[PDB]
Amino acid sequence: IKEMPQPKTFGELKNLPLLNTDKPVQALMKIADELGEIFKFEAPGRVTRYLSSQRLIKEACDESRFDKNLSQALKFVRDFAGDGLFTSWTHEKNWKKAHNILLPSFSQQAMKGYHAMMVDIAVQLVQKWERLNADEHIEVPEDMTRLTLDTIGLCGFNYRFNSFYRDQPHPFITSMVRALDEAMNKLQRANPDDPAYDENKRQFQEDIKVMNDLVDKIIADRKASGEQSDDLLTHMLNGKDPETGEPLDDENIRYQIITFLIAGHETTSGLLSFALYFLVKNPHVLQKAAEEAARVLVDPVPSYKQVKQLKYVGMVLNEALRLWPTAPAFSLYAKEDTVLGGEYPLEKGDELMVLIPQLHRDKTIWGDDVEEFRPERFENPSAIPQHAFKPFGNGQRACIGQQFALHEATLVLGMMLKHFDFEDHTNYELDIKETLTLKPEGFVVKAKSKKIPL
Ligand code: HEM
Ligand SMILES: O=C(O)[C@H](Cc1ccccc1)NC(=O)[C@@H]1CCCCN1C(=O)CCC1CCCC1
């Protein structure tokens, strides 16, 4: 049994000031590069261990030994996402109840029903870019966020954010973004009770009220109209858990909708932004993906079956998730006393953090060339060792949105590659901004139309 490395300390604050940065994931990645597959991290009243190797993470992903933990970040997000799926413990009644009711709404089969709505938003993006003048550029993560927010709004609850009609966000999104910022900002605070944070606290309660008031209204309005539109809100108002025989209540429905709007704004847009980043930095790869898009997408409007045929586009998206998993960490706790990797003894309740970008850089799995962008790593799914590739987390607490995110992203990237050539006109230097998620800040391109009608 070995003694675990630990990064540099700050007296009574232990390791906490290491999170005093706007790029804490990138900081934890550097520490893992220096210390290796496991390190201890201590704050006043808190210990966790950061895992980076497939060897240890495959053990952490054993659901008989470890369950999902709410990290401090998830506990602060729970002040507005409540006992929605993402911020509930596995043992809370509302977790399994919502999971049973919603799984069918998120299946690959259910994507056939969402396809038309996703095409509506995708075509708005392509039209935007077609309509730019020769001297203008594309603000990539800004546009991808407009698309992914609007898609979840229309598939989630038949609501149009109309993000392509606006520079300034919807009132709901102003409060959601500012609540998410406060939740992440509170991680690093040594003295959170200091009156310097009274205004932050006041503003946070106001933003929770805005989100609650606006979603509660959408739900009340739907119940009144009796309208049976094919969206997540209808499924949640009509669904019954086969286990309990119970439907979700209106409060839990509101938490699910806030949770989906977080995910729709934060995660899929990062994936699309990194994918386009890697393609413009790897023009041989962009040509392979552009050739597939041109060959497969033969109709003005892509069909569900055509999106399923975009294999190489799917490989580009998986290789973007390998290098920059846009939801880059999850947390586990030990169900019982156990020994991790024959070396590290854990007590019941001990917590683990999985650093997904480091897992995805494990040379024992991927080979020496782990920094190269090579979609061919994913030519064959079954060749990927179990628990090597975890951009959607683990087991029964894995992302319910995975099929949705990949269908949207494959559709969008396919249409972008059909309709435009791209130029990295500024020779962009990757700058990764961290919120809940990772995005390439300031990433801009020029698009030259191939002038193919919709
Ligand atoms: C609209 C798109 C998406 C929706 C609606 C969505 C929704 C969710 C929900 C509800 C959960 C909690 C599932 C549960 O525990 O029962 C979850 C977990 C997760 N999602 Fe997503 N998601 C989306 C996109 C993505 C994307 C694109 C990624 C990564 C690139 C991602 C990564 C994850 C991860 C890593 C977890 C596990 C979190 C943990 O263990 O703490 N999600 N998602
Ligand atoms: O939130 C936590 O408990 C710890 C940070 C922490 C460690 C020790 C003391 C206080 C905070 N979080 C993390 O290590 C990670 C990596 C750095 C940024 C914050 N982290 C997060 O998990 C943020 C939650 C996100 C939800 C989807 C993807 C991740």
Domain boundaries, the chain: 1-454
Amino acid at 259: T
On the CB side of 320, CA atoms within 13 Å amount to: 33
| 391 touches ligand 2 (CB under 6 Å) | no
Phi and psi at residue 45, in whole multiples of 5°? 80, 5
d(CA 325, CA 356): 7
C-alpha 438 to ligand 1 mean position (Å)? 14
- The H-or-E segment that residue 339 falls in is strand 338-340
Instruction: Please identify every residue annotated as catalytic.
Output: 267, 392, 399
C-alpha 247 to ligand 1 mean position (Å)? 22
The overall longest dimension of the chain from CA atoms, in Å, is 65
Method used to solve the structure: X-ray
Which residues sit opposite 421 in a β-bridge? 448
Atom of ligand 1 at shortest distance to CA of 84?
10
346, two tokens: 């854990």
How many C-beta neighbours within 10 Å does residue 15 have? 20
Q: For residue 37, give the nearest of 327, 331, 326, 343 by alpha carbon.
A: 343
| 270 touches ligand 2 (CB under 6 Å) | no
Which of 111, 260, 267 should be mutated for ligand 1, with most atoms under 8 A from CB? 267
- CA dihedral sign of residues 260, 262, 265, 268: negative
Query: Which string of b and e fits 180-194 if b means at least 16 CB within 10 Å?
Result: bbbbbebebeeeeee
Q: Under DSSP, is residue 240 helix (H, G, I), strand (E, B) or coil?
A: coil
| 263 touches ligand 1 (CB under 6 Å) | yes
d(CA 316, CA 251): 39
Q: Quick check: 327 and 452 in contact, CB under 8 A?
A: no
Which of 25, 360, 399 should be mutated for ligand 1, with most atoms under 8 A from CB? 399
- The H-or-E segment that residue 50 falls in is strand 46-51
Ligand nearest the Cα of residue 45 is 2
DSSP 7: -
How many C-beta neighbours within 10 Å does residue 344 have? 20
If phi > 0 it is left, if psi is from -120 to 50 it is alpha, else beta; for residue 342 that is: left
**277 carries a ligand binding annotation:** no
C-alpha 399 to ligand 1 mean position (Å)? 4
Ligand nearest the Cα of residue 185 is 2
Q: How far is CA 235 from the centre of its chain?
A: 23
> Which value in Å is the resolution of this experimental model?
1.7
C-alpha 143 to ligand 2 mean position (Å)? 27
The four Cα atoms 70, 337, 29, 149 give a dihedral, to 10 degrees, of -20
- CA dihedral sign of residues 196, 198, 203, 205: positive
Q: Under DSSP, is residue 452 helix (H, G, I), strand (E, B) or coil?
A: coil
Phi and psi at residue 4, in whole multiples of 5°? -85, 135
Atom of ligand 2 at shortest distance to CA of 328?
28
Nearest 5°: the CA angle 150, 170, 440 is 65
- Helix residue ranges per DSSP H, 158-197: 171-185
419, two tokens: 């309709």
Ligand nearest the Cα of residue 406 is 1
Q: In a 10 Å sphere around its CB, with 0-12 CB exposed, 13-18 middle and 19+ buried, how is residue 109 labelled?
A: exposed
Phi and psi at residue 334, in whole multiples of 5°? -75, 125
**50 carries a ligand binding annotation:** yes
Q: For residue 146, give the nearest of 408, 419, 392 by alpha carbon.
A: 408
Q: Quick check: 149 and 264 in contact, CB under 8 A?
A: yes
Nearest 5°: the CA angle 240, 113, 177 is 80
Please spell the DSSP secondary structure of 97-160, one letter per residue.
Answer: HHHHHHGGGGSHHHHHHHHHHHHHHHHHHHHHHHT--TT--EEHHHHHHHHHHHHHHHHHHS--
Q: Quick check: 158 and 231 in contact, CB under 8 A?
A: yes
DSSP 190: S
Phi and psi at residue 439, in whole multiples of 5°? -145, 150
d(CA 366, CA 359): 10
